């Protein structure tokens, strides 16, 4: 399927144990997609002071359209030293590995895969 319904655990930035997906734009997008498929991907809502507490390159989920079954359609955009790889809509948050942190909420998305 070109899209997959996911419910992503929303994590507090200070709880996150693994603060990024790797060391290159290509690796972080690769690992993010693998963790999304394996159900091991969390979401941190971007506010003042969040991104400096996480590791670059960043992987964002961005709104790709204006929401089937309650699931917002999203795609992945990576960022490294202020340059983005991909073009999309409003940021829903930054993806991180999930390794058992307790979420505060869930974010239903339809991921362009």
From Swiss-Prot:
Domain of life: Viruses
Record-annotated CoV Nsp1 globular domain positions: 2-113
Region listing for Disordered, in residue ranges: 1-113
Compartments in which it is found: Host cytoplasm
Function as written in the Swiss-Prot or TrEMBL entry: Inhibits host translation by associating with the open head conformation of the 40S subunit. The C-terminus binds to and obstructs ribosomal mRNA entry tunnel. Thereby inhibits antiviral response triggered by innate immunity or interferons. The nsp1-40S ribosome complex further induces an endonucleolytic cleavage near the 5'UTR of host mRNAs, targeting them for degradation. This inhibits the integrated stress response (ISR) in the infected cell by preventing EIF2S1/eIF2-alpha phosphorylation upstream of stress granule formation and depletes host G3BP1.
Protein name according to UniProt: Host translation inhibitor nsp1
Organism: Severe acute respiratory syndrome coronavirus 2
Shown residues in whole-protein numbering: 11 to 125 of 7096
């Amino acid at each position: 399927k070109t899209h997959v319904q996911l419910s992503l655990p929303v994590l507090q930035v200070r709880d996150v144990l693994v603060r990024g997906f790797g060391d290159s734009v290509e690796e972080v997008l690769s690992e993010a997609r693998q963790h999304l498929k394996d159900g091991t991907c969390g979401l941190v809502e971007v506010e003042k002071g969040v991104l400096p507490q996480l590791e670059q390159p960043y992987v964002f989920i961005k709104r790709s359209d204006a929401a089937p079954h309650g699931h917002v359609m999203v795609e992945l955009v990576a960022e490294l030293e202020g340059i983005q790889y991909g073009r999309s809509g409003e940021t829903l948050g930054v993806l991180v590995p999930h390794v058992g942190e307790i979420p505060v909420a869930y974010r239903k998305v339809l991921l362009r895969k």
